[PDB]
Design a protein around this nucleic acid. Structure first.
Lengths: 50, 129, 67, 132, 56, 60, 70, 185, 51
RNA sequence: UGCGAAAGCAGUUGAAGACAAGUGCUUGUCGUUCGUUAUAAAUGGCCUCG
């Protein structure tokens, strides 16, 4: 995904369908960030128990 | 895609070259039959050469070179030579002419004619209205 | 003092919160610590975004001719 | 809004040391920061000055609570990137390394905080459950 | 899992060994955290391009 | 199958054999390969150098 | 004056400063200044008004011969 | 001869071809006889497009001379091989190598051309029909190729194994021409 | 063809060189072997392709 | 390029000669030298034996 954005920045502007393919992607990648942050939190407290 | 050289008197095959990747639609040769130029669907113009004296004594052709000059098929090819002219003119589905030199086909320069040269105008504009 | 390189102080603090234990911690002070940590997490996320950013024809057109 | 923008524009032309104070003015909002960058930062010299001031400030205190200066940096990088790298000043490259070094720490600092945040959250919940 | 640790935290503390019996949990949780540094990097680039055409 | 003796190097003897296959076998009988040797020196000819389409079998 | 790929303008009241793939033409055929090549190829060029110039321009599957890129 | 940039000797060992800076010129000389003595600038051989293009196209990395002296193969850093007919300096372009060609060698009869380079693939160009036979996945890049025998029974190759940057790891490979199997490594 | 099943029991020397064909390659593996980088990517995203 | 962990911390990328092109001047190159720790792009992709 990093390459295609770095390689098709201009085609991105002129294509609407590509734009929504990122909008949902940004929402999904954001959701993964929340899970990974959440996983770190359960990881932190699990250390406290032991 | 094959170019074959047949002996006329015996009606037998002398040489076969699997040169093109698709149909060979047109062939042409120079005045002295030192070069044979083939072109077709694969957009390439192949040169077969027998200019060397050793080639002539043995009557063996050599797949000297090829060039990719067209964006589409090459339907027609023709050649002309004189004391002041040396042309290899080709064209096809691209709708444009390409001009090369027969003697210096491998390394010589080439010209791609404009698709439309409006010697006769197909458009007019009216200043009023 | 904390509520008032930093990880080597914070990671040390995380060791404190493990050493102190669940029971010994007090709710009143814990709230202040929670407000502090949530403050740093927001900032740390902000800086991470900045760091990544640093690492990162018409049919008819009207024009004026110069003559 | 218009007054501060005109003041900031004048200070950039005047090489004033007050450029930083203009940038921290509370009147600034995100949309006009975008408008200022797109409309008024038309010369590379002005762009370099704003980056140098912001980057130097952030380098000194990357943990400053004022989100405005980071907000300037974010949109300045997002909107004007193609020519920020076009700036060939050596000091501009050096200050970029300093800024990256300061922020690079913070990215390393984040995972520890999230763990500390998590262990506290359990403690608050357990205390609440014990109370109930 | 989050509620199990919170509610039964007292009982879990009084266990002779946790890592050997909770080894799978720690490994599973460790993998998710490793995504966070790279996901932020991807997110920043997505935001950089996402901001770009939205204003344009 | 057929014997072959090099017209120049009389010491060179060889057997060529072929069948309804896309390969040919050559068996070098030179020196003591024919009788004394415990093993046979066999080579397989299977490469036509771009002319596979013309040839389907080495049998003839 | 305009051709297939060029447009030119010449003022006839002012004198100019004095300072291969075609027949060599050894044989006979029988028996103030503006130049631009930005606009091409041209179907037709002419003036709509005194200050308006109308330039008209030109706006199939092929055998695939890939271009290697590393 | 002065300022010798590149040199090669025929398989028979009776002709010498060499490139000198007297840009550059190629000269071929009979070594035991005066029968062959020719010289010509490299500019005549080089294509005009090469003169337009970068220096890789005009840089010769390999050179081979036929036993009869009728043909001379020049390999370029671009990967393009050009066989030159010495009688009339006619060029023939053979283009398969994507990177620089390191080894060129003619067969004894001159009808085949061994070529090798960074591809780790040895190509026998059949010059009658311009075809080619391949031996790929060799152990290293081919520094040198030779046809070694009265009837071309064997091919002797030198391999480099460029993975090891610390040292140059040469390997000598003697292949059976009949079935292209390693007769002696 | 009455000798197809002899198997050379009574013979002095048996010579074996037959090599079994490699296991059938998929479309994506063939494209990679032939240096078809773009087509290999296309074979990645096709209906009914294992994740 | 030096050190170091993998993160990173410091420091470089100069001078002459020759050739080519354009117009003594400008630019670019070097199978040329001295000194310092110091994009690519000739349509050009890998064998057969079931």
């Amino acid at each position: 995904v990093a390459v295609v954005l770095e390689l098709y920045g201009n085609t991105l502007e002129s294509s609407p369908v590509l734009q929504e393919l990122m909008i949902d992607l940004k929402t999904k990648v954001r959701h993964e960030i929340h899970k990974s942050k959440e996983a770190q939190r359960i990881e932190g407290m699990l250390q406290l128990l032991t | 895609g094959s170019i074959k050289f047949w002996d006329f008197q015996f009606a037998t095959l002398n040489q076969s070259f699997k040169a093109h990747d698709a149909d060979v639609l047109c062939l042409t040769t120079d005045t002295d039959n030192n070069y044979v130029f083939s072109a077709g669907v694969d957009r390439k113009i192949f040169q077969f050469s027998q200019n060397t004296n050793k080639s002539q004594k043995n009557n063996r052709w050599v797949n000297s070179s090829n060039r990719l000059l067209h964006g589409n098929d090459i339907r027609a090819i023709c050649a002309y030579q004189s004391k002041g002219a040396d042309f290899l003119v080709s064209g096809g589905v691209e709708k444009t002419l390409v001009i090369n030199s027969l003697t210096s086909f491998s390394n010589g320069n080439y010209r791609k004619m404009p698709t439309v040269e409006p010697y006769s105008k197909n458009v007019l504009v009216n200043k009023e209205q | 003092f904390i509520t008032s390189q930093s990880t080597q102080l914070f990671q040390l603090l995380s060791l404190v919160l493990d050493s102190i234990g669940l029971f010994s911690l007090e709710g009143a002070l814990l709230e202040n610590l929670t407000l502090y940590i949530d403050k740093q997490v927001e900032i740390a996320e902000r800086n991470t975004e900045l760091w990544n950013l640093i690492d990162t024809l018409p049919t008819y057109t009207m024009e004026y001719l110069d003559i | 809004q218009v007054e501060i923008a005109n003041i900031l524009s004048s200070h950039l032309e005047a090489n004033s040391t007050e450029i930083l104070d203009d940038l921290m003015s509370g009147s600034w909002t995100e949309p006009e920061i975008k408008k200022f960058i797109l409309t008024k930062i038309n010369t590379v010299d002005h762009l370099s000055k704003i980056f140098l001031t912001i980057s130097k400030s952030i380098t000194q205190n990357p943990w400053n609570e004022e989100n405005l200066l980071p907000l300037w940096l974010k949109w300045l990088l997002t909107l004007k990137s193609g020519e920020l790298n076009s700036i060939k000043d050596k000091h501009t490259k050096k200050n970029c390394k300093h800024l990256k070094s300061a922020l690079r720490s913070s990215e390393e600092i984040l995972p520890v905080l999230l763990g500390i945040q998590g262990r506290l959250e359990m403690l608050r919940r357990q205390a609440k459950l014990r109370e109930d | 899992v989050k509620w199990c640790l919170i509610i039964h935290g007292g009982y879990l503390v009084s266990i002779p060994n946790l890592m050997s019996t909770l080894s799978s949990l720690h490994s599973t949780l460790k993998r998710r955290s490793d995504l966070l540094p790279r996901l932020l990097a991807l997110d920043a680039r997505l935001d950089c391009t996402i901001n770009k055409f939205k204003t344009l | 199958c057929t014997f072959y003796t090099s017209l120049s190097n009389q010491n060179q003897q060889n057997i060529f054999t072929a069948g309804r296959r896309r390969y040919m076998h050559s068996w070098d009988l030179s020196l003591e390969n024919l009788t004394h040797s415990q093993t046979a020196k066999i080579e397989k000819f299977s490469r036509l150098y771009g002319h596979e389409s013309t040839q389907r079998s080495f049998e003839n | 004056f305009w051709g297939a790929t060029w447009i030119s303008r010449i003022d006839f009241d002012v004198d100019f400063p004095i300072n291969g793939l075609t027949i060599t033409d050894e044989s006979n055929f029988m028996n103030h200044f503006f130049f631009t090549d930005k606009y091409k190829p041209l179907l037709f060029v002419d003036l709509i008004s005194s200050n308006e110039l109308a330039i008209i321009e030109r706006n199939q599957k092929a055998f695939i011969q890939p271009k290697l890129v590393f | 001869w002065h300022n010798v940039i590149l040199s090669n000797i025929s398989s028979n060992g009776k002709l010498l071809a060499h490139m000198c800076k007297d840009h550059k010129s190629i000269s071929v000389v009979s070594l035991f006889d005066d029968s062959v003595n020719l010289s010509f600038p490299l500019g005549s051989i080089l294509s005009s497009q090469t003169q337009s293009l970068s220096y890789n196209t005009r840089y010769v990395s390999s050179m081979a001379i036929d036993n009869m002296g009728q043909q001379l193969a020049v390999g370029f850093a671009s990967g393009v091989i050009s066989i030159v007919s010495l009688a009339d300096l006619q060029i023939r372009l053979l283009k398969w190598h994507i990177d620089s060609v390191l080894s060129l060698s003619f067969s004894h009869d001159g009808s085949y051309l061994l070529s090798g380079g960074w591809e780790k693939v040895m190509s026998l160009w059949q010059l009658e029909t311009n075809s080619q036979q391949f031996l790929p996945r060799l152990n290293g890049i081919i520094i040198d190729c030779q046809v070694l025998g009265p009837q071309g029974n064997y091919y002797s190759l030198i391999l480099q194994m460029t993975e090891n940057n610390s040292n140059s790891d040469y390997q000598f490979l003697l292949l059976n021409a009949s079935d292209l199997t390693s007769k002696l490594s | 063809m009455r000798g197809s099943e002899y198997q050379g029991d009574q013979e002095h020397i048996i010579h074996n060189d037959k090599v079994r064909s490699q296991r059938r390659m998929r479309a994506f593996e063939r494209n990679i072997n032939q240096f078809k980088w773009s087509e290999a990517l296309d074979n990645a995203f096709v209906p009914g392709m294992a994740k």
